[PDB]
Scaffold this active site. Structure first.
Site, short mmCIF file in Angstrom:
data_model
loop_
_atom_site.label_atom_id
_atom_site.label_comp_id
_atom_site.label_asym_id
_atom_site.label_seq_id
_atom_site.Cartn_x
_atom_site.Cartn_y
_atom_site.Cartn_z
N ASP B 230 0.84 -1.16 0.00
CA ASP B 230 0.00 0.00 0.00
C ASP B 230 0.89 1.23 0.00
OD1 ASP B 230 -2.34 1.87 0.72
OD2 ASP B 230 -3.22 -0.04 0.47
N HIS B 284 -3.09 3.60 -4.07
CA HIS B 284 -2.48 2.88 -2.97
C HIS B 284 -1.05 2.49 -3.19
CE1 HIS B 284 -6.27 2.73 -0.77
NE2 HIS B 284 -6.78 2.67 -1.97
N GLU B 349 -10.69 2.74 -5.37
CA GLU B 349 -10.87 4.01 -6.00
C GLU B 349 -9.68 4.87 -6.25
OE1 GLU B 349 -13.47 4.43 -7.87
OE2 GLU B 349 -13.43 6.45 -7.33
C1 LIG Z 1 -11.54 -1.58 -0.81
C2 LIG Z 1 -11.32 -0.75 0.46
O1 LIG Z 1 -11.88 -1.06 1.51
N1 LIG Z 1 -10.50 0.31 0.31
C3 LIG Z 1 -10.08 1.24 1.39
C4 LIG Z 1 -11.17 1.72 2.19
N2 LIG Z 1 -11.99 2.62 1.67
O2 LIG Z 1 -13.13 3.10 2.63
C5 LIG Z 1 -13.95 4.06 2.10
O3 LIG Z 1 -13.53 4.83 1.24
N3 LIG Z 1 -15.22 4.15 2.58
C6 LIG Z 1 -16.11 5.04 2.10
C7 LIG Z 1 -15.90 6.42 2.15
C8 LIG Z 1 -16.87 7.30 1.65
C9 LIG Z 1 -18.05 6.80 1.09
C10 LIG Z 1 -18.27 5.42 1.04
C11 LIG Z 1 -17.30 4.55 1.54
O4 LIG Z 1 -11.40 1.28 3.47
C12 LIG Z 1 -10.36 0.56 4.19
C13 LIG Z 1 -10.50 0.88 5.68
O5 LIG Z 1 -11.77 0.42 6.15
C14 LIG Z 1 -8.98 0.96 3.66
O6 LIG Z 1 -7.95 0.26 4.34
C15 LIG Z 1 -8.95 0.55 2.20
O7 LIG Z 1 -7.65 0.85 1.63
#
Ligand SMILES: CC(=O)N[C@H]1/C(=N/OC(=O)Nc2ccccc2)O[C@H](CO)[C@@H](O)[C@@H]1O
Ligand SMILES: CC(=O)N[C@H]1/C(=N/OC(=O)Nc2ccccc2)O[C@H](CO)[C@@H](O)[C@@H]1O
EC number: 3.2.1.52
Lengths: 575, 575
Positions: B230, B284, B349
């Site tokens: 990451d 990442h 994303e």
């Molecule tokens: C696939 C994933 O979960 N990506 C990231 C991740 N992304 O979370 C969000 O972006 N959540 C979110 C934010 C705004 C709206 C909807 C979901 O959550 C993890 C922590 O729980 C990170 O470690 C990850 O790198």
């Protein structure tokens, strides 16, 4: 693989250690992360930060690990304790060195001098002196003079703990380092700094209890509150009334023998930790009392009708024999928990319904002219507490302070009908904003703060009955525990606050989960109680990350607060 | 102290084991808690419960621990694996015995017969056969015949795991016991049953990873998804591009060498666990890429403007050299992660802002007629993925399935412009109720369920940036993980769901906290994936408590679900 070497260096910029490449074409000496941190941070690597002088100077000196010698200048009755404390210290210094790393055996020799001004004093008390002074300076050409001066062994042990924190390992060079010029003066703001461990809802190995105490000592927490019995189990080994443990324990192995308890108590004393026992009554009793006829409602169903949580059960105050059992239990506790100056008698909420359910009880009330309403049940509780209290005093062989939880009994409005401020200390678990607190303070009551909104370490997991999350969720982060201030809670009546305690109720915790539950969150409390900083959590954030790493090095399975990248890259992770 | 003996006995009443005193004046044989549980519960002590025949009979037989012999009937290419599995089994049986307790060496001899029908087969695949049959019966006068029959080594190893669960220790008598008459037939509902471990946000010792795998095997979970890199760190040792780890790692020690990885991969194979590697791209990425000029926005401030979490950073798809680096990384991974049939390519994303910030990037876009709006950035992502994908295939030496997270790229509405259903498996982290799921299913896409409302194991702790609690709070209890059903989520398109995976993101987790985070909650997932029960969590509750105890016996520092009193007193704790 050929293991690499550390490739980075750190430089101080605006209070933050920034990671930079350690380039070869430079005339400026590279700094390791901890070394940079020690001078970049206002309080360096210290936790808790000192309350008085805190001069760390500007330099570090290379030290030889095998050349540390401790000399005790004033001998006394605490010689054994001092000798033990000194030995522990050599071991602590090593904790500076990360596992699998080996320092070069070169550098100065360190002489540690301990001056305990009242070498005979070893009792725990609310009035005990935990102050100390620390000075470090170069001595001659090849050595260091580290001098700790304190009024008592306790201050002296706190001083050794602070001194151990002045060592850093330089992983760039493999050198063990120590701060060169130090002037520190310190004492705690509050006398009672504790952790409550509930060992009845689930059993905790004695090894775990000792490990907990080791961690507490590392941050100058001084009280371990052992909530030894409850309705779920009776693990205390009472020689006088052996059936309680025999029937009471989760298993024959899941018990606390007299030898184990002495062992824990002694381990605590060496580390400046008072081991305070609680026998909760008259509620929170159950297992171990079968066949005595001394309880009512054990396992009553439906549980919701009769208690806060299953299993239900309470003592029957109307049985004279109960006071005999109680005297014996209190006496057995007093024998082994022999360093404690205080005794906790529980008193968390008693159930009216449960008492009203016993005709044996109603008859007693009928005979005494009392009715069967709420006011009368309060009379019964007072009758019990007064009798139990007499037994407690007889057991301890003196009148000593007693602690009770906030409850219906302790409502400030009628508390004086029952208790008095000299004899009773009140442990507060209401929110920090509850009116009971001001009311209690105005009546002159001393308090221990354990407000559930900030200090309940059990909070936030899954529900243990039904689905969802547990009762006091959300989970309380260190930030919140750090910002919870008794001074703010109490204002002008501050002196009346004895301190605070983090509570680990054990419906959902045991030997396996304890390091995580307690650490490093209790450290937040330790600093708050020790120093009462006007500053907020954000000012203590970098140091908190360090202390967490330190607990891990000690073998504590501490919770992880942030990505390690944040620790290496200060100021980058924020919100 | 003279240690007592267990004083209680248990009796089955309406599906609940009730604790009763073991009175001397009785002609009925006393039952120990586990013994009563084995027949009182519908599925006894099994986790997960079987999908076919589950006949446990009515009796237990005393067994001698030293007389267990395993014989492998059909030899093949998997001989080494079978021999290893057999050895592990003897050790597992002991786990029945609580620590510090010693069984009497008396009783029957147990003969275990393993029939692996395709002894040469050892590859992991989505189509692999994990079925098995188990029969236990008395053989002659002094022995037991335990026969496991399976189509492959994998089914056979699952069968040994189930068999180990048929042993109970009678602590009343100190006898090791085994179920006498057993007929079991089993196979999993879903092929992919996993745990994602993020080892870049924080480092996990290789010992911890192996311990995790041991726990997984115990409940028939078959996939360990290693989120190895990451933005925060690059611990993978890539021989071809060594600077990434050299610069990338949190420390020189905090690394995963080729030998360590082979070791983990092999340990996994012996236990039926596929070790699946993820190299997340193009977002990442961060540490380890300094001085390559192959990333943009590393440590960009303010972070909120450019990414989901700090540190920010992304690959620059416009640099040809990047594909060379990528080929080398994928090749190094393929060499050591040699049991995997699938490769995860990340794809969570990507940041538009971050890409738009690079003129080098804009120029490239300008030259290609694309504009600088959102639609165009999607083109850039596709350009990257197509190229990275080619490198992945070249590295693995064949076309193999690739996994991507749900994202803007994977929106079902335009997903076909970019991906195809044969080549890409989509890992879903949206809520279980999100419309993307139905849309994706309708387009023919296969999925792995990791919906964050039920499967994010990181959720619920304190905030790691700022104060409060972390993003996906509240904490998810086992009850919730157990009730989350892919069959319900997908309906008629069920076959398209490959399975599920619990995710442990590591912003707030490491070596110290992993046993707690994963266990026993992953066990809830294991049963749900293995069996797809029509039943709810409450029906599985007693068994869940047992499995937790089992994980603890294994040395796993598992979370505590309920008071032990509840385990001893079924039906008393409810809501
Ligand atoms: C696939 C994933 O979960 N990506 C990231 C991740 N992304 O979370 C969000 O972006 N959540 C979110 C934010 C705004 C709206 C909807 C979901 O959550 C993890 C922590 O729980 C990170 O470690 C990850 O790198
Ligand atoms: C003093 C105390 O905390 N008592 C019990 C206790 N009592 O909690 C409440 O009764 N909370 C509450 C319920 C309704 C209204 C206000 C507070 O909480 C702990 C678990 O967090 C139990 O282990 C304790 O035995």
């Amino acid at each position: 693989v050929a293991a690499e070497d550390v490739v980075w260096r750190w430089s101080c910029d605006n209070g933050k250690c920034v990671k930079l490449k350690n380039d070869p074409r430079s005339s400026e000496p590279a700094l390791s992360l901890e070394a940079c941190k020690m001078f970049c941070n206002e309080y360096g690597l210290l936790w808790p930060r000192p309350t008085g002088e805190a001069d760390l100077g500007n330099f570090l000196s290379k030290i030889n690990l095998n050349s540390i010698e401790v000399k005790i200048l004033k001998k006394g009755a605490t010689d054994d304790l001092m000798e033990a404390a000194a030995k522990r210290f050599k071991e602590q210094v090593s904790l500076a060195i990360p596992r699998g790393s080996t320092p070069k055996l070169t550098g100065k020799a360190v002489d540690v001098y301990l001056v305990n001004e009242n070498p005979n004093e070893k009792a725990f008390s609310l009035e005990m002196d935990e102050s100390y002074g620390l000075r470090v300076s170069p001595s001659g050409a090849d050595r260091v003079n580290a001098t700790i001066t304190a009024n008592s062994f306790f201050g002296m042990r706190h001083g050794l703990e602070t001194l151990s924190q002045l060592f850093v390992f330089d992983d760039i060079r493999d050198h063990l380092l120590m701060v060169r010029d130090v002037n520190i003066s310190d004492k705690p703001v509050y006398p009672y700094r504790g952790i409550l461990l509930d060992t009845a809802r689930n059993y905790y190995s004695i090894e775990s209890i000792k490990r907990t105490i080791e961690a507490m000592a590392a941050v100058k927490l001084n009280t371990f509150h052992w909530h030894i019995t409850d309705s779920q189990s009776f693990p205390f080994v009472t020689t006088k009334r052996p059936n309680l443990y025999k029937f009471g324990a989760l298993s024959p192995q899941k018990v606390y023998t007299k030898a184990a308890i002495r062992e824990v108590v002694r381990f605590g004393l060496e580390r400046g930790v008072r081991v305070l026992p609680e026998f909760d009554a008259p509620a929170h009793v159950g297992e171990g009392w079968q066949d005595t006829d001394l309880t009512v409602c054990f396992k009553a169903e439906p549980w919701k009708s009769y208690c806060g949580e299953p299993p239900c059960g309470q003592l029957n105050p109307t049985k004279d024999e109960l006071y005999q059992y109680l005297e014996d239990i209190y006496s057995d506790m007093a024998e082994v928990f022999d360093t404690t100056d205080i005794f906790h008698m529980g008193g968390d909420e008693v159930s009216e319904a449960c008492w009203n359910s016993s005709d044996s009880i109603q008859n007693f009330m009928m005979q005494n002219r009392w009715d069967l309403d709420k006011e009368s049940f309060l009379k019964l509780w007072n009758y019990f507490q007064q009798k139990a209290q007499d037994k407690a005093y007889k057991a301890f062989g003196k009148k000593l302070p007693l602690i009770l939880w906030t409850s219906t009994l302790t409502n400030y409005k009628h508390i004086d009908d029952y208790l008095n401020k000299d004899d009773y200390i009140i442990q507060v678990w209401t929110t920090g904003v509850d009116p009971q607190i001001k009311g209690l303070l105005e009546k002159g009551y001393r308090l221990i703060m354990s407000n559930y909104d900030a200090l309940y370490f059990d909070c936030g997991y899954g529900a243990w009955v039904g689905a969802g999350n547990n009762w006091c969720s959300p989970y309380i982060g260190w930030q919140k525990v750090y910002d919870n201030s008794p001074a703010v809670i109490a204002l002008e009546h501050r002196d009346q606050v004895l301190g605070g305690e983090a509570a680990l109720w054990s419906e959902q915790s045991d030997t396996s989960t304890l390091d995580g539950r307690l650490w490093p969150r209790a450290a937040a409390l330790a600093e708050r109680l020790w120093a009462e900083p006007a500053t907020s959590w954000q000012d203590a954030e970098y140091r908190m990350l360090h202390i967490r790493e330190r607990l891990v090095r000690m073998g504590i399975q501490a919770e992880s607060l942030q990505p390690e990248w944040c620790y290496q890259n200060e100021g980058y992770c924020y919100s």
